[PDB]
Structure formats: structure tokens, C-alpha cells
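Fold this complex.
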Amino acid sequence: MKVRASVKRICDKCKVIRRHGRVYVICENPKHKQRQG
Amino acid sequence: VVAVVKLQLPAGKATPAPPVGPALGQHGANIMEFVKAFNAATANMGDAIVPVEITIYADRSFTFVTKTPPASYLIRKAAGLEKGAHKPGREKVGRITWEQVLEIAKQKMPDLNTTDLEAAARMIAGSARSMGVE
Amino acid sequence: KRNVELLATLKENLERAQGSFFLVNYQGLPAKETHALRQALKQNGARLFVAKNTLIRLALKELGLPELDGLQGPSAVVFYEDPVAAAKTLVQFAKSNPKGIPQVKSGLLQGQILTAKDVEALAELPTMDELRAELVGVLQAPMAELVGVLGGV
RNA sequence: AGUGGUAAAGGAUGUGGCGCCGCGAAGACAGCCAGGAGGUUGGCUUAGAAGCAGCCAUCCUUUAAAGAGUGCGUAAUAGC
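Structure:
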């Protein structure tokens, strides 16, 4: 999943991953694919 | 073969429905309807957490003997905890006499971790709190 | 802030209530199996802080403040510190030896120990599972000050 | 970052800077080891709570110091 915005993590322990100016949240639940870069 | 499992039934009744029980009569045990045999035993034990609790031999069998009530339950067993009849509390039939807790054990303080020369002062403060006697 | 006034003011208090404590690495025991060797401590002993599983640096270094001759017997690995001072250390040593020995692969090994004032030797702490009821030093005096008439018989 | 070399709302364990909080060398945190303690065993519901099913409980002893048990869960329970 992605969104040019939003992202305030989620899966209770959803990870704030720094990758290529790529605000990408990584978790253990596909539901959180947080791609906002 | 051989290997039994742990279990905790009630202290008074004997009817073996869901406690004696898909538990014993499965993972490892014998026969069922442990109720009829439970009444002839739990009858003299059941009103303060009594563990024995539930096993199964090569018969299987059986009732008789027991353990008693868990610590707290056995410490404030002489209360009534008649409450809980609605939500978590909370009105009518609450106290159980400041001395009662001590008088109730007193004896009701033999089988316990390591040892305890008092289950009405320090033991009660704990269990009693779980019920409502904080 | 923060380790000093708290806990540290009790580690030397419950371990200084006398002069005859020990040390044993207790831990390799399940909550249930562990609550048996410790909870029963009251039986073989008497609440004697038989090493309530202190830790390190706190118990070892603690010797400084109190100056218990520095129980330099074994600070590494687990550190229980059997408080034989706060109870009745002497012959009960056995009540703790067989228990944490005849059950499971080495229930709980021993460490250091102070004999009234001296340092209990590692190899000279176990074999003494039964604290010499003083009879020992008396089993070679009166029966050794009147036995030249027994070979006198 | 190529911002240099147009942009806001707003988003962020960016970069560097405060002026501040944790240091029990009674030697720290992520990494480690093991135990994860006995009353903890209904209150309803008990088909099951006997923390890991819903309407609150906020006590006790007891030591690694203590989980009125933050969490994977089903039939309670049992395991992490």
C-alpha cells in the first residue's frame, strides 16, 4: 500500500523505515505496506 | 504411557459434564461421568479453590481424597463473595468479619509454597483483594 | 541516581544480621520447582537469606561497606548468596545441599561462605552438608584426652 | 538533497544545533542465559478465564520481585 502522505504507523509496532527519502513503513502485516515516497 | 495432565474441578459437586470432562477423558485418562464420584468427594471440599484436580488412570479412577482451596480463596473462603451478581462488585454482602479472615485460617493454611505461619493477615490482604476485601 | 540508597541499604542489612553467610548460584529451576527449594528454606533453615538471587557488583562490592572480609569465593556466573546469617546456619547446610543436588542436573551449586568469621573453602563447604554441631572439635578432645586406658582396656 | 535552479496543508527512530532529561560502578540500554514463583483457579460465563473470551475488581503472603498478568489463542485450559 502507498499514499503521497498520511502514515502515522499502525500495526501497534509498525516500523518507520528510512529508505531513499522514501518514507516507507515496514511491518509484520501486509496491511501496513506504507509507501509514501 | 505413562503421562497424566493437570486439572482443577470444583469442591462439592461431582457431576462430570464439561470438566471431567473433555480434559481428562481425552489427553490422557479413562472412563467418564466422574461426577457421581466427584460428589462423594468434593462434597467435603469445594468453596475456596480446591485443586486435586483431574487425571485419568487405567480404569479409569477415581474420586476420593483431594487437595483444598487455593491460597487466597482458602484464606478468605470464610467470607461469602456473594457479590459479583452483576458487573465487578459491588453492593450488599461484602464484609466477612475482620477476625473471620484470621479464624478461617488459622487451620486453612497448611499446604502452601515453602510455608506460612499466617494466612489471615498477609494471605488475606492478597486474596481478599481479588474478591473485594481490600 | 539511582543505585546506592535503595536496595544497597538492605543488601548489607539482611546479610549483616550476623556472621555466617554463604553463596549459591540458584536460578536453573522453574518457578514451581524454584519456589520449593527457596520457600522450603524456612524448614531446613529459617528465612536465612540463603542468597535471594542477588546479582553481581552489588553483593560482591557490598563487602566493602560492611567489610565481611570480602566473600571472595565466587562472584562470576549466577549469584544467590545463601544468607545463612539471618536464620540459623550451621548444620542446615545439608537441608540445602541434598535438595539442590538430588534433584535435576546440579540443582544449585555453592560459592563462598564465612565460618563465623573465616572464609569457607569451596571444596570445604559441600562435604560439610551437616554443620558440625560443635561435636566435631569435641569428638577428638574428651574422647582423645581419655583413651590411653582404652588401649588401656 | 543537487535545495541552488519558485509552492502551501501537512507528514515523518532527515542533517546538524540547543537550552535540557536516564547513568544505582548499590557498573548502564538493543544484543545474552535461565526462572519465568505458590493463594493467584468466580464476579457473570464456568461449554472456558484457572492473566492470553464481555460489566469492575486494584488485596496477601512470597523472592529471581513480586505484571489488579501489555501480548500469539482455542474448549476451557494447555505453550510462547
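The two ends of chain A are 12 Å apart (CA to CA).
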